[PDB]
């Protein structure tokens, strides 16, 4: 059974390891995927790798006009969204002493502002009963040297899954966060290795799929046990 047969998915960060692995799994599970990213060349290469049932959309998700353009494309080509994987994110290490206004704004714009507006602008297209997955991080629950803004931003992302669970419940839209650990640390991790992108994708699939139909507002750690022991 194709677990996303004929579903429409939008994946932001189709330039990340996890966004591409997710797109591949989703196409293997029968979905039509829009992969979204800032860098056109890697996007087009990714779409060529995936090979079928995929459209690449160049967009900077921090720019409201780019989001409007994305959604117009999705509306015209597929008409509605079943699964939204809001997978933005970038880290720059700076200690508290080293933080500048620019570093703060870059970190929060990509990890938080971009996410909020990605999901806001998807709402008209999202089907009732749909599924929204947010990318948090183990950093959201840890105290890692020089991850000040990144960890704080990923904590913000996890919180938005709770709030959107409440706000969207009338439409039966589930919102859940995935919190990856180290993806290709290993020493602190019970499984004794970094995770493969396809293992993160499989977890995202769980959340996108009907197997998680009674799962809402959670933080799914995909970290080999790092944060759990």
């Amino acid at each position: 059974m194709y677990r996303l047969l004929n579903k429409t998915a939008v994946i932001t960060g189709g330039n990340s390891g996890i966004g591409l692995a997710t797109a591949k799994r989703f196409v293997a599970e029968g979905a039509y995927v829009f992969i979204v990213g800032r860098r056109r060349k890697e996007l087009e290469q990714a779409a060529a790798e995936i090979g079928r049932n995929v459209t690449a959309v160049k967009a900077d998700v921090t720019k409201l006009e780019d989001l409007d353009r994305l959604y117009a494309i999705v509306r015209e080509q597929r008409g509605s969204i079943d699964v939204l994987f809001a997978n933005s994110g970038a880290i720059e290490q700076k200690t508290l002493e080293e933080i500048t206004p620019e570093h703060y704004d870059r970190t929060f714009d990509v990890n938080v502002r971009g996410l909020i507006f990605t999901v806001q602008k998807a709402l008209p297209l999202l089907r009732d009963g749909g599924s929204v997955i947010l990318t948090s991080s183990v950093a959201g629950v840890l105290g890692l040297q020089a991850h000040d803004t990144y960890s704080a931003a990923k904590a913000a992302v996890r919180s938005l899954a709770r709030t959107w669970t409440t706000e969207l419940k009338g439409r039966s839209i589930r919102v859940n966060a995935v919190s990856p650990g180290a993806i290709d640390f290993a020493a602190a991790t019970p499984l004794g290795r970094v995770g493969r992108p396809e293992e993160l994708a499989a977890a995202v699939l769980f959340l996108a799929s009907d197997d998680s139909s009674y799962v809402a507002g959670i933080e799914l750690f995909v970290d080999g046990g790092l944060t759990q022991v």
Copy 2:
């Protein structure tokens, strides 16, 4: 990737094959290609459950609070299948009693089924568990809430969640993952965002995630399957 049968040729042991959740899980496991042992106290209801499941299932009568019963179970598994890939340690019982009402007998009944029994269930499965296998523990939303008259049940289910952490550590050299599932309301109640009780088959689907290779980088977790109850 996708597979018609996500547990093909795997051997699963499910305790609480008299419960709604244990039964629904056995059905889904068989649908996924597994061979299932369903384990429970009441033989007749077990044999009816095995008839409902319909194929690739052995019913085993066993009271998991009795060590000799566990030894009998594992002998049966060893003779029939030879190894265990997935262990769903799912026996449980709830009785409501407030603190002022708690008796020694109530305490012991709750802890013996939910904690002592679970410990010995898993301990005695270790020689048969395959490296790289998956163990799923049934905790509960009760393990993180303060529900009137759930004193011992909630405490015991918090203990169960703890054991998933400890056993993640202790079994890591064998690459055996240990995870807890924490159901909310299933079939009956006890604000929930999804606005309804869960179905046993929805819990089963989440256990399947943990049993399956889709959760291969998932270890030590508490997976709430509660329609959002504990998350907002």
Copy 3:
């Protein structure tokens, strides 16, 4: 200005009061003006502890796993002081055993002291607890960790933490606050915890006592059902 005596004329009952955190807490409580009952199994160690505390203390020999010993305790408390303002249910014992090693006896001893004893300690205190009183439970960082060979201890301490939530609900009509304290390492394995702890050391028993005093005192009057980690940051980073 400040209060000289933060527990002035309050009556406290501390189980496990004969040593460690229970003893440090009894000392601080007495310093803060409380009258304390210290409870333990061995008369000689109790008498030594009472002598160290030095004043405003009654030692009561009792095995808190034995219902009859609890009844005897609370008869004494009622006679001598009438009612209880603070109950620090501070039982606890650890024996390391891996899953493979666990015997029924090891299970029962761990749960009897950490959980059964606790439940009955609190149950039997109820008629004497003043409304607005404070009940402090001893959990552990082990309750949230996956520590090799701590199977039963960790699980028991998780159960303790849970009871603080349930008892918060049950006792809210009486305005009795119930909170858990979760110590880290307190003065090889100890060195391993110190290295993983931000503050880079084990805690002193008096620092645990001071945290229990927060929960016993009016400073925590709007704190209920919590798990207060007192671990130098071990579990928080």
Copy 4:
């Protein structure tokens, strides 16, 4: 040796948001406990009234903590008047309710500027004055662990605040500086204690974190919510 009666005797405390509410009640208790307090806020008149209410051992400083230059001015005052900081209560915060569909860029930036950016630069700029072994308290909220209707940005920002307590515990451990978050509930039906909290009850919990009683307490989230989030 026994306990000290005045639990912040001669310590220097800086309290942002010190003109009202929790920050004011904290300032009053800190002064009762023997501290010297700097109360920080945006409006002169309210600050002067607050300082008159506190009544002694207090300096009011007008500053918008979202402006780096206002923070530099604050810390120059503290450095000249007291010389060092023992306790920092980084008590920023403001809520505007908006649902996801309603959020604008301006609403987002206001919420994050006051609750997160302001906090970060408040603590950053205090570092040179903070004594080794000092205590930093951050104001998070119960919102940081809940899914409340129309609290999208506020809740998210308060979760970010709690995270920073973790990171700063790691970064500041070599100086033995403790960083903890306080998460208030309702302050003056779902709460076990069956009432809102008084500002003085929040101040007492902040006092615990500021004081030596919490010397082995680091990186935590102290819920002061009458049980709301715990049951």
